[PDB]
């Protein structure tokens, strides 16, 4: 009949090919589709939703709900650091196990922007001010309130707004999101002074993820049964 | 570079999900695998980011043999042929290597001689419902959901051999096709413990450091 000629790589099994395949069960008349709410077309839609960041690990709050709460009290010092965490990727940091960082551990190369939303979970009668400094990659962490003001910063007034949004790039020193006391917490009588702060993270623009791999957070020693 | 995070480029991969051995003359030797996705820990974590899935199925078997120590006197065997029977949900099940359930007509089998391309076969979306369900909050025993049932596979030799014992292994490769996913779900933090249920032991939220600043 027709003369053919088999090339090398013919009777092999490459695990990442895409060929047609003979159906074991034809003539079955499968069940038609149904409108189920909440269809996912892309995994980036899971990364763009917010999630609380455990900034307060401290070796015994990781097995509690105290990891998510940043303590704020009325102290006696003039300028003092509230928190601070680097943006180094993956190296045991606080953005690792969040809803964003569980997707970026499935891929090898990624680059984009990051939303960082804060929220003052205190009383409605308390008033204060905070700096939200950002160190670029390469620049050092500020060791004082004054040279944190001389960089890029956002002064967050608690008595006016109760949420501050801070957009920032993050690419696979890599940055710091340190925060400082500007003024103390002024409070009336019969109102508690020790307040808390929650922090959120998201994906501002669309990222670009590439070169899928397996996650380092899951392993098994013998088949579950 | 935004398209490698789609549902088709995330879940449609190949993965070794089972590995079993069987010999010919032990009169107990044949393999058996109930088709599920909850055996390995890296495919289970990817399919449990969503609640309802709906996919076709494509399986490829890699079968090798090995000569067991016989007695003496010039063991010379021909090529070996294997049978890979697929039992649909609600079908007869073999208990011995010689049984009436191997010869039934509604269990589609493949026959494959050694030295050729591996025997791929494909299974469509078989269910009474409209999607598979990774999670089930209810009773059938708690959280079983008998509606997503894909069947069972059985493997054996069809060659009778007396001069030499021969044992064989098989690796089953798993690949979803035309995947659709609904209702996303947060990724699992604790390690997996059992296959059927979602039992766990409580673990910390993240890795800890020495100070907040």
């Amino acid at each position: 009949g027709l003369p053919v000629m088999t090339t090398p790589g013919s009777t092999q099994f490459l695990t990442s090919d895409d060929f047609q395949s003979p159906s074991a069960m034809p003539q079955f008349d499968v069940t038609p589709e149904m409108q189920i709410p909440g269809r996912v077309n892309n995994l980036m839609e899971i990364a763009e939703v917010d999630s609380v960041v455990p900034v307060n690990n401290t070796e015994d709050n990781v097995s509690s709900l105290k990891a998510y709460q940043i303590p704020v009290q009325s102290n006696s010092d003039n300028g003092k650091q509230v928190f601070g965490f680097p943006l180094q990727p993956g190296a045991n940091n606080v953005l690792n196990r969040t809803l964003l960082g569980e997707i970026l551990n499935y891929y090898t190369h990624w680059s984009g922007s990051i939303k960082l939303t804060f929220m003052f979970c205190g009383s409605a009668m308390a008033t204060g001010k905070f700096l939200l400094a950002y160190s670029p990659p390469g620049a050092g962490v500020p060791k004082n309130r004054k040279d944190a003001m001389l960089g890029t910063h956002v002064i967050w007034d608690v008595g006016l707004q109760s949420s501050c949004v801070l957009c920032v790039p993050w690419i696979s020193a890599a940055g710091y999101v340190t925060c400082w006391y500007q003024t103390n917490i002024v409070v009336p009588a019969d109102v508690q002074s020790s307040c808390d702060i929650l922090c959120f993270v998201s994906a501002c623009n669309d990222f670009s993820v590439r070169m899928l791999k397996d996650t380092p957070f899951i392993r098994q020693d013998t088949f579950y049964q | 570079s935004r398209s490698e995070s789609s549902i088709e480029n995330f879940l449609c991969r190949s993965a070794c999900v089972y590995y079993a051995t069987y010999t010919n003359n032990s009169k107990k030797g044949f393999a058996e695998w109930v088709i599920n996705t909850r055996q390995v820990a890296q495919l289970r974590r990817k399919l449990e980011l969503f609640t309802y899935l709906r996919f076709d199925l494509e399986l490829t078997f890699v079968i090798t043999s090995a000569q067991q120590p016989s007695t003496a006197s010039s063991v010379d065997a021909p090529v070996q042929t294997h049978q890979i029977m697929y039992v649909p949900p609600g079908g007869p099940v073999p208990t011995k290597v010689k049984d009436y359930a191997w010869q039934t007509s509604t269990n589609p089998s493949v026959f494959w001689t050694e030295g050729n391309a591996p025997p791929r076969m494909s299974i469509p979306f078989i269910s009474i419902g409209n999607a598979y369900s990774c999670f089930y909050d209810g009773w059938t025993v708690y959280g079983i959901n008998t509606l997503n049932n894909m069947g069972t596979l059985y493997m054996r030799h069809v060659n009778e051999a007396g001069q030499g014992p021969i044992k064989s292994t098989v690796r089953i490769y798993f690949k979803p096709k035309h995947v659709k996913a609904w209702v996303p779900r947060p990724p699992r933090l604790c390690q997996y413990e059992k296959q059927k249920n979602v039992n766990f032991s409580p673990i910390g939220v993240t890795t800890s450091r020495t100070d907040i600043i």
Partner: nanobody
């Protein structure tokens, strides 16, 4: 990937000892660490475990009032202290790491505790 215990001990009746089991090759605060006692005339016997993430311990009913299991994140060890030592507490104590809820995959080499005068 292995576990390493201490050396052999020796104590008077009424005194107390403290063993250890240094884990290496894996993330220490993920899996629980169990303790098994083997008297030389009988089989193995379970004592209890400790969850190294939340420092939650759960003991057997026979070993509740004597043993005490602690841990630390820095040196990646897991201690065990036996109090009110008697003559039937002379055995070999192993440390094991449980995975998949029943399997003890990795064991230690065991420490020999002897009581005398």
């Amino acid at each position: 990937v292995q576990l390493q215990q201490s050396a052999a001990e020796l104590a008077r009746p009424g005194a107390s000892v403290k063993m250890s089991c240094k884990a290496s090759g894996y993330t220490f605060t993920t899996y629980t660490m169990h303790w098994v006692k083997q008297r030389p005339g009988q089989g193995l016997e379970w004592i209890g475990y400790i969850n190294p993430s939340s420092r939650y311990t759960e003991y057997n009913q026979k070993f509740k009032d004597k043993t005490t299991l602690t841990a630390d994140k820095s040196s990646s060890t897991a201690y065990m202290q036996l109090s009110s030592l008697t003559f039937e507490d002379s055995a070999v104590y192993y440390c094991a790491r449980r995975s998949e809820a029943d399997r003890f995959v990795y064991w230690g080499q065991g420490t020999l505790v002897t009581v005398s005068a």
